[PDB]
Amino acid sequence: VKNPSLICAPVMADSIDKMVIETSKAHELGADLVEIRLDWLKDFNPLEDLKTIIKKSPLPTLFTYRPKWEGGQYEGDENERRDVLRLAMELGADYIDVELQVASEFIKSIDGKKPGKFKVIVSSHNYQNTPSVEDLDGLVARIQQTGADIVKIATTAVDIADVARMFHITSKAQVPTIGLVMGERGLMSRILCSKFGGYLTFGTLDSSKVSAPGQPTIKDLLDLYNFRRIGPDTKVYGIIGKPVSHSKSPIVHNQAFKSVDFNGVYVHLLVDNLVSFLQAYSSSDFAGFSCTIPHKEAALQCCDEVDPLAKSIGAVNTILRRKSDGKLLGYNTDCIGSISAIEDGLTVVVIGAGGAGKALAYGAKEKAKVVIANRTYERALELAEAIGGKALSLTDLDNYEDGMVLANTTSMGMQPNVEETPISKDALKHYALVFDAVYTPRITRLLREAEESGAITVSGSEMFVRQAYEQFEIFTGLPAPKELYWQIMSKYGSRENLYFQ
Numbered sequence: 001v002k003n004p005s006l007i008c009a010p011v012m013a014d015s016i017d018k019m020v021i022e023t024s025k026a027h028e029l030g031a032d033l034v035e036i037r038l039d040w041l042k043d044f045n046p047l048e049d050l051k052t053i054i055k056k057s058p059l060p061t062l063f064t065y066r067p068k069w070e071g072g073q074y075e076g077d078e079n080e081r082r083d084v085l086r087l088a089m090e091l092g093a094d095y096i097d098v099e100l101q102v103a104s105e106f107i108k109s110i111d112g113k114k115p116g117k118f119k120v121i122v123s124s125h126n127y128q129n130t131p132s133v134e135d136l137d138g139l140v141a142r143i144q145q146t147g148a149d150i151v152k153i154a155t156t157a158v159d160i161a162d163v164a165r166m167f168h169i170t171s172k173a174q175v176p177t178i179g180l181v182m183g184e185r186g187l188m189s190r191i192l193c194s195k196f197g198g199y200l201t202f203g204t205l206d207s208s209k210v211s212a213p214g215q216p217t218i219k220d221l222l223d224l225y226n227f228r229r230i231g232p233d234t235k236v237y238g239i240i241g242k243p244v245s246h247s248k249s250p251i252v253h254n255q256a257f258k259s260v261d262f263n264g265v266y267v268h269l270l271v272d273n274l275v276s277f278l279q280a281y282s283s284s285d286f287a288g289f290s291c292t293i294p295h296k297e298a299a300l301q302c303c304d305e306v307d308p309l310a311k312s313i314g315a316v317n318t319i320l321r322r323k324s325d326g327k328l329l330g331y332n333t334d335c336i337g338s339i340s341a342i343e344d345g346l347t348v349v350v351i352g353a354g355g356a357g358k359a360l361a362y363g364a365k366e367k368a369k370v371v372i373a374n375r376t377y378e379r380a381l382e383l384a385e386a387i388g389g390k391a392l393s394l395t396d397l398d399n400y401e402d403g404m405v406l407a408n409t410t411s412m413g414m415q416p417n418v419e420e421t422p423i424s425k426d427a428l429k430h431y432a433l434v435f436d437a438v439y440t441p442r443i444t445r446l447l448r449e450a451e452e453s454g455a456i457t458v459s460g461s462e463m464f465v466r467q468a469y470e471q472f473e474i475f476t477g478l479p480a481p482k483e484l485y486w487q488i489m490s491k492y493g494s495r496e497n498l499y500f501q
């Protein structure tokens with residue numbers, strides 16, 4: 001619906017002087033406007049302070065004076081709260097946000113008294129879930145019925161599938177609509193506003209100034225997700241997983257997409273149920289997906305067609321939705337990714353029997369013997385007796401035969417479990433090379449103690465980048481820009497302890 005989405009910065013400093021500085025920071029970061037959350041001011045002298053903000057703000061101002069009954073910090077007299085909003089309007093505010101509950105009354109009190117460049121946003125906040133399209137429409141009509149210039153509906157994501165309903169609302173409602181879904185599971189709704197008609201999205205001045213759950217930073221929206229490039233036709237891709245907030249796939253793919261001018265955007269996809277997810281996002285808009293724990297094997301089953309190597313391995317980490325029939329094709333780039341990294345580093349002990357374990361184990365047999373150690377024995381057992389290998393009780397891993405190579409394919413060691421390692425340091429001696437598929441952190445405890453053991457270490461980054469540029473080729477149909485990916489990872493994927501949520 002209409003213009004690309006604006007980016008609004010929430011201003012919550014508890015002091016007016018601090019808010020003035022934040023509005024300047026908002027402009028520096030690239031925001032289009034700022035939402036002044038008046039309910040967060042410790043001391044507030046309405047007439048004097050509003051004037052100061054409107055006068056000093058380098059960006060258009062949106063004033064909100066959120067009450068405790070609507071999830072804000074304001075308590076006290078309702079008429080006084082409204083007086084402030086009317087005051088903001090008559091002092092030159094670009095917008096004010098008024099709760100649907102009192103919208104009609106408010107709008108009637110300023111009828112014929114609204115300045116020229118002024119818009120009233122009427123908002124509704126749902127903290128429990130995301131209602132049906134039926135209920136959402138009723139909500140939109142009610143808000144429009146108040147006389148609102150702009151409709152704002154904030155819901156909560158119980159499941160990622162919920163977002164699709166909000167996109168349908170912003171995409172089809174014939175009235176300026178700010179539609180967002182709160183929570184990590186609703187993050188995608190804050191990122192794709194420009195593709196689906198959203199009037200604006202909120203981005204934080206920094207990762208610690210959140211006014212609502214799931215809000216990304218302005219810097220990430222603009223530089224990580226390439227917000228300004230997202231349009232009605234951009235194809236959407238994403239990393240399916242749980243957890244998924246540590247994934248750096250959105251970093252590399254968005255950089256690569258931008259570099260080669262491919263019209264696509266890549267986001268994080270926190271998926272609880274793979275089947276419901278795929279069904280909720282089956283349109284052509286969603287062209288491809290990357291899969292990590294714990295949806296690699298399930299992805300194999302969900303794919304209409306499966307590549308020989310994938311079907312052979314028993315796990316899929318790459319899903320491509322073919323334009324033709326529109327079906328799902330499954331591929332596996334983990335095998336070549338990890339195996340290649342290991343050979344480059346140069347009997348294989350594979351920790352973990354999940355999709356990554358299958359892929360690595362499989363690839364390995366295709367070239368010495370391989371033992372599959374896994375806590376859940378049944379899993380390691382099934383795998384072991386598939387690639388013609390031996391299983392092993394995880395507890396017995398600390399003992400073993402020398403010059404062997406160790407390959408962890410489990411999440412052990414991944415942030416925030418930075419002091420966790422799948423094997424005792426004293427047992428690393430029996431290994432020549434140690435590989436860790438975990439790449440966040442780059443240097444896990446396993447790899448660190450492995451190096452202190454004189455063994456050669458192959459970081460997860462080596463495998464991650466490799467499997468990533470192969471996915472780029474699958475998603476785009478363009479030659480894998482290998483050198484580019486290494487450069488992107490090095491320049492944009494080196495910070496640790498990052499969580500996108």
Ligand SMILES: O=C(O)C1C=C(O)[C@@H](O)[C@H](O)C1
Nearest residue numbers: 239247248249290291292317
């Ligand atoms: O984004 C990640 O963390 C990814 C991690 C690995 O499991 C790859 O197989 C995925 O394709 C991408």
